[PDB]
């Protein structure tokens with residue numbers, strides 16, 4: 001049974017003052033404590049370019065198909081010329097029309113944010129329209145795939161609240177089977193990009209999450225277990241001038257602020 005949302009007004013005001021004083025940054029964030037109900041929403045409902053954070057919803061859709069016998073973990077996926085994308089990933093250096101186990105592809109999509117792997121999954125699951133429908137079914141309202149990855153131009157959309165609320169659902173054991181849930185959380189704890197939200201956590205805390213960076217937007221979303229027994233979900237997105245370190249630093253500062261507040265409470 002999940003407590004009622006209970007906004008920490010004072011922490012929320014502090015965070016609001018911190019984001020608003022940064023010229024040329026536009027930030028949105030949502031945190032929810034599963035034990036206390038403590039919430040923070042500073043622009044958490046606003047729509048952002050998703051960047052790679054969209055790979056987290058695609059992962060859930062993947063495992064949904066597995067659960068429903070529509071995809072198998074071991075079946076061979078083809079890296080067709082038309083699925084090959086630049087930027088992050090290792091699959092792009094392999095021979096065109098070589099093949100990979102579906103689970104290997106799904107893992108690469110998340111752990112190293114492989115854009116080729118991602119377009120292979122989007123294709124395997126029936127395309128952008130099909131996935132968009134699924135996202136709406138889960139209550140994601142502004143989570144929308146418009147173009148293939150890496151989508152440098154920022155056309156694919158989501159919201160901090162969408163990303164956190166899906167993770168809350170998964171955390172509480174909704175949508176996916178037990179086995180698929182536990183696989184997804186394992187995968188999400190082995191990403192190589194841990195410089196945003198995890199950088200604000202204290203010693204011994206763990207986090208399942210997924211980052212995104214297209215230069216003009218940086219973000220991160222997932223779920224934190226604190227050594228005191230507490231759990232919360234977290235999502236933050238920042239619009240910035242191209243590669244501005246201040247955008248990434250802001251995410252660390254807000255992560256730190258929230259983590260420390262929950263230790264006190």
Ligand SMILES: *C(=O)[C@@H](NC(=O)Cc1ccccc1)[C@@H]1N[C@@H](C(=O)O)C(C)(C)S1
Pocket residue numbers: 051052053086087088112113115150193210211212213214215
């Ligand atoms: C998703 O946003 C992806 N971004 C890109 O491919 C563009 C890019 C930007 C900077 C360096 C390399 C590639 C992938 N996800 C982000 C992320 O998870 O933060 C990466 C930087 C890993 S690439």
